[PDB]
Design a protein around this ligand. Sequence first.
Ligand code: ZN
Ligand code: ZN
Lengths: 114, 115
Amino acid sequence: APKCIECHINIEMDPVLHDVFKLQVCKQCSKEHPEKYALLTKTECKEDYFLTDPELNDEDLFHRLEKPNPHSGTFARMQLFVRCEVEAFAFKKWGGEEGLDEEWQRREEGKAHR
Amino acid sequence: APKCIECHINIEMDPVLHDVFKLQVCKQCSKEHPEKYALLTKTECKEDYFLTDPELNDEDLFHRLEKPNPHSGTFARMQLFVRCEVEAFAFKKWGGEEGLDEEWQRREEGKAHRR
DNA sequence: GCTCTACGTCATCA
DNA sequence: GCTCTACGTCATCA
Ligand SMILES: [Zn+2]
Ligand SMILES: [Zn+2]
């Protein structure tokens, strides 16, 4: 049978990482490696990775899971991205983590400015 | 025999102001009164009246005529609004002609700030 | 640790 | 004297 690609043991994949994000990763290894598998909100993606609404709303660029807004089911749907995908785009976009941290550096000066 | 609201004489209305802007006015009168009947582009509307893309897109708030973009037919469509509508909305929004003039005054001063 | 949008300008590109 | 979008923050509101 096919095996979790992190641990090489488990045969029962995490239903969400599997069905939605297309990753053969079991549940236990999703927890044990949040640097890869942690589901972040759309706002977490904007602020941590400086991704813009036009790239987060590309259907053809990220998988997503959509959830009712925990604040109210009449507010816009919660969207959830798997961290390795957004990270992997964000590292192209800004040229690696070195380059990412420099844009963090750049905007915080902007606040001292204001 | 319905008559032109401007001249009170012609029976034949300008087909565009009639069909599209729902105005009972003749070609000759639209011409003589640009202050009421001139068709303005979407971009003329933003420059001159400080209306915004969200207002000008409201299907339920202005009539519009659409023509192919005169620069290229591959480009986004030209959108044409009638000056009585536009000016009317903008006067409500900016508190009259005087208020629209103040707003003008304010955005010139945004450029004197950015030298 | 929720999201959309609109402000605001302008530059592109279309 | 053509149009949209994006790039900016946020705030507000949904
Ligand atoms: Zn595993
Ligand atoms: Zn007439």
